[PDB]
Design a protein around this ligand. Structure first.
Ligand SMILES: *[C@@H]1O[C@H](CO)[C@@H](O[C@@H]2O[C@H](CO)[C@@H](O[C@@H]3O[C@H](CO[C@H]4O[C@H](CO[C@H]5O[C@H](CO)[C@@H](O)[C@H](O)[C@@H]5O)[C@@H](O)[C@H](O)[C@@H]4O)[C@@H](O)[C@H](O[C@H]4O[C@H](CO)[C@@H](O)[C@H](O)[C@@H]4O[C@H]4O[C@H](CO)[C@@H](O)[C@H](O)[C@@H]4O[C@H]4O[C@H](CO)[C@@H](O)[C@H](O)[C@@H]4O)[C@@H]3O)[C@H](O)[C@H]2NC(C)=O)[C@H](O)[C@H]1NC(C)=O
Ligand SMILES: *[C@@H]1O[C@H](CO)[C@@H](O[C@@H]2O[C@H](CO)[C@@H](O[C@@H]3O[C@H](CO[C@H]4O[C@H](CO)[C@@H](O)[C@H](O)[C@@H]4O)[C@@H](O)[C@H](O[C@H]4O[C@H](CO)[C@@H](O)[C@H](O)[C@@H]4O[C@H]4O[C@H](CO)[C@@H](O)[C@H](O)[C@@H]4O[C@H]4O[C@H](CO)[C@@H](O)[C@H](O)[C@@H]4O)[C@@H]3O)[C@H](O)[C@H]2NC(C)=O)[C@H](O)[C@H]1NC(C)=O
Ligand SMILES: *[C@@H]1O[C@H](CO)[C@@H](O[C@@H]2O[C@H](CO)[C@@H](O[C@@H]3O[C@H](CO[C@H]4O[C@H](CO)[C@@H](O)[C@H](O[C@H]5O[C@H](CO)[C@@H](O)[C@H](O)[C@@H]5O[C@H]5O[C@H](CO)[C@@H](O)[C@H](O)[C@@H]5O)[C@@H]4O)[C@@H](O)[C@H](O[C@H]4O[C@H](CO)[C@@H](O)[C@H](O)[C@@H]4O)[C@@H]3O)[C@H](O)[C@H]2NC(C)=O)[C@H](O)[C@H]1NC(C)=O
Ligand SMILES: *[C@@H]1O[C@H](CO)[C@@H](O[C@@H]2O[C@H](CO)[C@@H](O[C@@H]3O[C@H](CO[C@H]4O[C@H](CO)[C@@H](O)[C@H](O[C@H]5O[C@H](CO)[C@@H](O)[C@H](O)[C@@H]5O)[C@@H]4O)[C@@H](O)[C@H](O[C@H]4O[C@H](CO)[C@@H](O)[C@H](O)[C@@H]4O)[C@@H]3O)[C@H](O)[C@H]2NC(C)=O)[C@H](O)[C@H]1NC(C)=O
Ligand SMILES: *[C@@H]1O[C@H](CO)[C@@H](O[C@@H]2O[C@H](CO)[C@@H](O[C@@H]3O[C@H](CO[C@H]4O[C@H](CO)[C@@H](O)[C@H](O[C@H]5O[C@H](CO)[C@@H](O)[C@H](O)[C@@H]5O[C@H]5O[C@H](CO)[C@@H](O)[C@H](O)[C@@H]5O)[C@@H]4O)[C@@H](O)[C@H](O)[C@@H]3O)[C@H](O)[C@H]2NC(C)=O)[C@H](O)[C@H]1NC(C)=O
Ligand SMILES: *[C@@H]1O[C@H](CO)[C@@H](O[C@@H]2O[C@H](CO)[C@@H](O[C@@H]3O[C@H](CO)[C@@H](O)[C@H](O)[C@@H]3O)[C@H](O)[C@H]2NC(C)=O)[C@H](O)[C@H]1NC(C)=O
Ligand SMILES: *[C@@H]1O[C@H](CO)[C@@H](O[C@@H]2O[C@H](CO)[C@@H](O[C@@H]3O[C@H](CO)[C@@H](O)[C@H](O)[C@@H]3O)[C@H](O)[C@H]2NC(C)=O)[C@H](O)[C@H]1NC(C)=O
Ligand SMILES: *[C@@H]1O[C@H](CO)[C@@H](O[C@@H]2O[C@H](CO)[C@@H](O[C@@H]3O[C@H](CO)[C@@H](O)[C@H](O)[C@@H]3O)[C@H](O)[C@H]2NC(C)=O)[C@H](O)[C@H]1NC(C)=O
Ligand SMILES: *[C@@H]1O[C@H](CO)[C@@H](O[C@@H]2O[C@H](CO)[C@@H](O[C@@H]3O[C@H](CO)[C@@H](O)[C@H](O)[C@@H]3O)[C@H](O)[C@H]2NC(C)=O)[C@H](O)[C@H]1NC(C)=O
Ligand SMILES: *[C@@H]1O[C@H](CO)[C@@H](O[C@@H]2O[C@H](CO)[C@@H](O)[C@H](O)[C@H]2NC(C)=O)[C@H](O)[C@H]1NC(C)=O
Ligand SMILES: *[C@@H]1O[C@H](CO)[C@@H](O[C@@H]2O[C@H](CO)[C@@H](O)[C@H](O)[C@H]2NC(C)=O)[C@H](O)[C@H]1NC(C)=O
Ligand SMILES: *[C@@H]1O[C@H](CO)[C@@H](O)[C@H](O)[C@H]1NC(C)=O
Lengths: 148, 452, 148, 148, 48
């Protein structure tokens, strides 16, 4: 209806804003990602026998896909050492053949969507060892160094 | 001057997503009658408030033509019908040969018939003759005094709709799940495809009522604009046109016969709904339009198409000239029996170089329909008893050119309605589902203690 | 049957005990929360064709609701920085218009159920920023301070 | 087909190798554990009405069991303080009535399968208090010691 | 063994009249009957 301007800004409300602005609004995304219970109730908000109407089970397929792609996403975080923590710093340098531009030149200049588009091709290969050189051989260390 | 590549959870990001969506509609208790067509009791209730939030300076593509939510939103509608039918009574002991001729009237206007006829009672070897009243289209002849057979008997079976269920359409809000999201476009002059500069975020559709209509749409959404309307590619005739208004004009379809009915028992629990005696006048199904508004809403539909065939060119119109009985004329539902009017008065004008006078449009009523162009078990529509009267709110129409002739001299064209899902493009063109890709790597200078 | 008194105390066995007592028995709850496999086996502990008996799929609806409400609960922990850790300390002060009473006055005096009842109304509003003022702007800090 | 030897080594490719070798290849297992989306697509890679063919829903049963046994496994890690971290050190001593042999004598001598077989009987009992004596009463401490 | 464990000094409401598990526990019993019947023989040639 008529626009009300009381709350700011909202889920993906920073998609049209640069990465620096949205980098601060990471949580108005993280809660809306998984929650398939706030919006769908275990029991409803008598002629029918059982509820295998296809409103029933293809709602049912949706709820798990809601979680599993989250659940495998957050496992990637469990691979890289960031489980309960939304941002994550990183040890292996960036050799910039994936992008030649600066630090200001992205957070102030572009947006998140406008950054994936360009390295969408280099995406899989990086995730190869943001754990291996970062975590696979981060903790044989404190294995071999808490050894004493 | 050293650069690390560090990750972030919850980045506003999205991908053209293909996934199955779900419906949400505010629940009507409605303990009087029961069992809606589609919503039934399974659709989840809409939240007290569905949150709408503007995506600022965002511009994102939209292509309603390879859009999938329509191929879904009819994939459903066909489906659950075939499970709202299956529990209802199966009408195969009726394909019997059941003699009749014309109905009592001074011979004026295949108005209707009245057959008297064999049937099986609750008991097996026991039989019975009783009478009913059919319409021209439901039956076809073969041979004596005289007697015909039911038009579908030729090729398909029938399951009569339970009159407990009703086909009054109600708003349906399709919903994308967590891990995805739909999204709406929000500029009025937007045409069929292109990126939308004004965008705001929804997760569940506004209330779409699935009106079963061929060649026209009505009681639909209405844009605050001057009715600018799109094709898959206007340059070609074969791909349809889909108008929809800016101020709706009223439509009231009528037949003023008070039908009577009579439950009669075919067997164990099966009760066939025979139409009974007519009491009162004989009166044909029709529909009123005041041209004053029609020709002037027409008038604005006139001038805008011009912006694609030159500002100096012919335009044209007359009635549908191709196809079957069901789609050449206005197929739709009103109150329990379906209509089929020649839209003759309407497509009546040429407008070049830029007291009530109400149209009245004769229709015929059906009872046994092979809908959605699907051969197989038919549906017998039970009658409707007493008067009928349905008001209406024209919002749009569907049209198709005829093609080959001299360019820009005088090309002609005509409403087509070759498929229905153009009914779904009517109000599913703001919307587009999209994936959540919420995690992004990006380079900053931070890094925690190198533990060595 | 006849009561046997060998094990102590059990799942929610500290519900009738004060918050301090139950605060130590947080794990006899955390394992019984999700585990829908210990009690339900992937294959059973031949005339039938397939198992779409409604014992089958409305058991099936239950298992995911078992996880998703856990999974969204533990995401809230992932919002507040406590993923693998059951208790969690906290930075933003408590202004006590939500409850005027003391520290001893709850752990020794009341029980957990007897504490939610009173602030059940103030529940949603607090969860607004046990992350924002606690974690949303806890790590732009070490973003801006591991900057060097 | 004919064997190609370009990649090394793979999922469970260290099952025939000693625990020390496989102890370094813990991640070529952790990603293949949950991922039921990489291999199964939310929409397919028109005569049919709806897809309740039993290819549909007993694929559907599989996906959740894929996650829940992971999800309850990783909850055990959430019980022991290791959520995002694959290996985990430990405080309560090992009294070796569960195995009398050495440290070299397992990582260099045996493999992982060849170690569970022998203490498969002592398995449940140990998990009793790799949290209680390790984490249940690890953080009433920093409750009582961050007290100040 | 199903584990039974006493909740000590706990007092909690009970109203068996708007209780739902009954409306379920008959919702079932009606239901699966209508699927223990459907595979069995249909007796309509007998109303003779
Ligand atoms: C464009 O938009 C337009 C604007 O909305 C649309 O116009 C709509 O058109 C549809 C028809 O297609 C209308 O639906 C029908 O309207 C009838 C007229 O409503 C009058 O009465 C209203 C008050 O009474 C209604 O409401 C009360 C609850 O408040 C209810 O108890 C009552 O039964 C009745 O429904 C009044 O407010 C209005 O202003 C009107 O004056 C209405 O009578 C119709 O109800 C019928 O039909 C439907 C369809 O099958 C059934 O589902 C209903 O249950 C009911 O049928 C029952 O009653 C009949 C009465 O004779 C019986 O013959 C039936 O067999 C059945 O009775 C059985 O079942 C009962 C319940 O179990 C038992 O008690 C009985 O004993 C029997 O067993 C229906 O609502 C819309 O109303 C109309 N809109 C508006 C705003 O009016 C237009 O259609 C749109 N265009 C398109 C293309 O869609
Ligand atoms: C398609 O069909 C639709 C539907 O048929 C068409 O749209 C409808 O068109 C109607 C116009 O013909 C319109 O309704 C009418 O309203 C008139 C009032 O308008 C005039 O007066 C007002 C001021 O009062 C002006 O503002 C206005 O400009 C006009 O000058 C009524 O006069 C009409 O008829 C009376 O009878 C009808 C029954 O049909 C009553 O419903 C109506 O109310 C009228 O008066 C009685 O009822 C009222 C209360 O309802 C009483 O106050 C009054 O005294 C009368 O008394 C009776 O009732 C009382 C109880 O209240 C009782 O004590 C007493 O004894 C009497 O029994 C007529 O109603 C519709 O609104 C309109 N519908 C829609 C949806 O737009 C459409 O045009 C068609 N389209 C085409 C293309 O054909
Ligand atoms: C939906 O509703 C609309 C609204 O009407 C329908 O529109 C109608 O559609 C039908 C299609 O079936 C059209 O019919 C076709 O009409 C032509 C013209 O008819 C001529 O041929 C017949 C012989 O077949 C002559 O008898 C006619 O005679 C008229 O003119 C002479 C003088 O010229 C006069 O002596 C006659 O009395 C009659 O005149 C009277 O009426 C006219 C106005 O109509 C008036 O000017 C005059 O003064 C008198 O009042 C006429 O010359 C016809 O040839 C076509 O032939 C087809 O059928 C015949 C058999 O009848 C076959 O021989 C032939 O091979 C074809 O098969 C069609 O019948 C009709 O014109 C049209 N009407 C309008 C107003 O558009 C839609 O059809 C409806 N749709 C559906 C699906 O129901
Ligand atoms: C549905 O489709 C079926 C398919 O055939 C239709 O078939 C009809 O079947 C019936 C029974 O098989 C046919 O009945 C015929 O009746 C005539 C004359 O009957 C009159 O005279 C009889 C004495 O001769 C008398 O018994 C009759 O009824 C009396 O008794 C009843 C009570 O029992 C009472 O209600 C009456 O008032 C009378 O008191 C009636 O008065 C008969 O001549 C026919 O010939 C047969 O039998 C003779 C020997 O008698 C034999 O020589 C013939 O070869 C033949 O075998 C037969 O009995 C009926 O005629 C069929 N229909 C038609 C059009 O002929 C059926 O009608 C369809 N609709 C339904 C069933 O609703
Ligand atoms: C479309 O077409 C339908 C037809 O189906 C119309 O529906 C009819 O509308 C009229 C309204 O004009 C209704 O009449 C009303 O009935 C109610 C209730 O009736 C009670 O009260 C009346 C007196 O007012 C009374 O007549 C009724 O009693 C019956 O039984 C009595 C014996 O106990 C007997 O004395 C009486 O006369 C009547 O029976 C008679 O009829 C039968 C055959 O029909 C005959 O065998 C018998 O011997 C008698 O002669 C009852 O107590 C009243 O309150 C109203 O005042 C008004 O009379 C019709 O009932 C109704 N019919 C149906 C089937 O619905 C639609 O209106 C029409 N609509 C339009 C828009 O055209
Ligand atoms: C993302 O990575 C992919 C893969 O490297 C890049 O795609 C490649 O882009 C080049 C264009 O520079 C394409 O080369 C072209 O090939 C034709 C002959 O087929 C040649 O005539 C042209 O002159 C040109 O060289 C190449 O085909 C294409 N390959 C694939 C697999 O897509 C892409 O450019 C990268 N995108 C960004 C934004 O970095
Ligand atoms: C009352 O019922 C009779 C049927 O028993 C109707 O008679 C029918 O009249 C039409 C013409 O009005 C005949 O149609 C004819 O069709 C042939 C082609 O099949 C065509 O060449 C002719 O020119 C004509 O159009 C039809 O045959 C005839 N039915 C018969 C003889 O059985 C009559 O029309 C009905 N009453 C009303 C008012 O319609
Ligand atoms: C939890 O928070 C809610 C919301 O503030 C509290 O509910 C409110 O309680 C007051 C009682 O102090 C109710 O006020 C009453 O209103 C009537 C008029 O309607 C007036 O005549 C009475 O004298 C009294 O002032 C108020 O209606 C009620 N509001 C709602 C939405 O429930 C509740 O008390 C809080 N509970 C605890 C344990 O703190
Ligand atoms: C894992 O733990 C189980 C449980 O302690 C061990 O199983 C036990 O193994 C002994 C063999 O040393 C079995 O004792 C035998 O009993 C018969 C009489 O029934 C006696 O005649 C034999 O001389 C022998 O003493 C005992 O039945 C068996 N119990 C169970 C429940 O399996 C198992 O050996 C342990 N495995 C490893 C690899 O440590
Ligand atoms: C029919 O169209 C009207 C708008 O032309 C829709 O809204 C109605 O608008 C009139 C004034 O324009 C108001 O007096 C009515 O109260 C409005 N009705 C409602 C229900 O909002 C109307 O909704 C349309 N009818 C439908 C959709 O059935
Ligand atoms: C426009 O269409 C109408 C029919 O909707 C035509 O109206 C006919 O006009 C004559 C008067 O010459 C009437 O006697 C007829 O009754 C009308 N027919 C009907 C079916 O109502 C009208 O001729 C058309 N005009 C043009 C130029 O196409
Ligand atoms: C003007 O009309 C002619 C034919 O009358 C047509 O060929 C031409 O395209 C038109 N020009 C414009 C600009 O519409």
């Amino acid at each position: 209806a008529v626009g009300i301007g009381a709350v700011f800004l909202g889920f993906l409300g920073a998609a049209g804003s640069t990465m620096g602005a949205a980098s601060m609004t990471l949580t108005v995304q993280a809660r809306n990602l998984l929650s398939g219970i706030v919006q769908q109730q275990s029991n409803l908000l008598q002629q029918h026998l059982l509820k295998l109407t296809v409103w029933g089970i293809k709602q049912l397929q949706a709820r798990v896909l809601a979680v599993e792609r989250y659940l495998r996403d957050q496992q990637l975080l469990g691979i890289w050492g960031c489980s309960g923590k939304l941002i994550c710093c990183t040890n292996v340098p960036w050799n910039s053949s994936w992008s030649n531009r600066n630090l200001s030149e992205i957070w102030d200049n572009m947006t998140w969507l406008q950054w994936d588009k360009e390295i969408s091709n280099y995406t899989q290969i990086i995730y190869g060892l943001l754990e291996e050189s970062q975590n696979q051989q981060e903790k044989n260390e404190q294995d071999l160094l808490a050894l004493d | 001057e050293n650069l690390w590549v560090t990750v972030y959870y919850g980045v506003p990001v999205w991908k053209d997503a293909e996934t199955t969506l779900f419906c949400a509609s505010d629940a009507k208790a409605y303990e009087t009658e029961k069992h809606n067509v589609w919503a039934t009791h399974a659709c989840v209730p809409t939240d007290p408030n569905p949150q709408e939030i503007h995506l600022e300076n965002v511009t994102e593509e939209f292509n309603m033509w390879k859009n999938n939510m329509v191929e879904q939103m009819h994939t459903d509608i066909i489906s659950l019908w075939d499970q709202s039918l299956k529990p209802c009574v199966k009408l195969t002991p009726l394909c019997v040969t059941l003699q009749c001729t014309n109905v009592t009237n001074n011979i004026t206007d295949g108005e209707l018939k009245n057959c008297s006829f064999n049937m099986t009672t609750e008991l097996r070897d026991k039989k019975q003759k009783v009478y009913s009243l059919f319409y021209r289209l439901d039956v076809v002849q073969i041979n004596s005094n005289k007697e015909y057979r039911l038009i579908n008997c030729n090729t398909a079976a029938i399951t009569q709709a339970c009159p407990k269920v009703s086909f009054e359409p109600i708003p349906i809000h399709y919903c994308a799940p967590a891990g995805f999201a739909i999204l709406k476009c929000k500029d009025k002059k937007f045409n069929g495809t292109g990126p939308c500069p004004s965008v705001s975020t929804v997760q569940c559709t506004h209330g779409i009522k699935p009106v079963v209509s061929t060649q026209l749409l009505l009681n639909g959404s209405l844009a605050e604009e001057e009715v600018m309307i799109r094709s898959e590619n206007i340059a070609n005739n074969a791909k349809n046109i889909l108008v929809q208004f800016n101020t709706p004009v009223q439509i009231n379809c009528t037949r003023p016969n008070n039908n009577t009915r009579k439950s009669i028992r075919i067997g164990p629990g099966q009760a066939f709904y025979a139409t009974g005696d007519i009491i009162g006048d004989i009166r044909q199904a029709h529909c009123n339009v005041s041209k004053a508004t029609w020709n002037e809403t027409l008038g604005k539909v006139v001038k805008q198409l011009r912006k694609h065939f030159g500002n100096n060119t012919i335009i044209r119109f007359a009635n549908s000239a191709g196809g079957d009985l069901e789609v050449t004329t206005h197929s739709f539902n009103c109150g329990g029996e379906f209509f089929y009017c020649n839209t003759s008065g309407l497509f009546n004008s040429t407008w070049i170089s830029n007291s009530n006078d109400s149209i009245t449009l004769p229709c015929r009523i059906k009872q046994i329909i092979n809908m959605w162009q699907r051969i197989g078990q038919a549906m017998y529509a039970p009658p409707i008893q007493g008067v009928i009267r349905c008001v209406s709110n024209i919002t749009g129409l569907i049209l198709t050119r005829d093609g080959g002739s001299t360019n820009s001299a005088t090309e002609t064209f005509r409403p087509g309605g070759g498929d229905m899902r153009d009914n779904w493009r009517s109000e599913l063109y703001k919307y587009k589902v999209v994936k959540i890709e919420p995690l992004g790597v990006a380079p900053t200078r931070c890094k925690r203690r190198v533990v060595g």
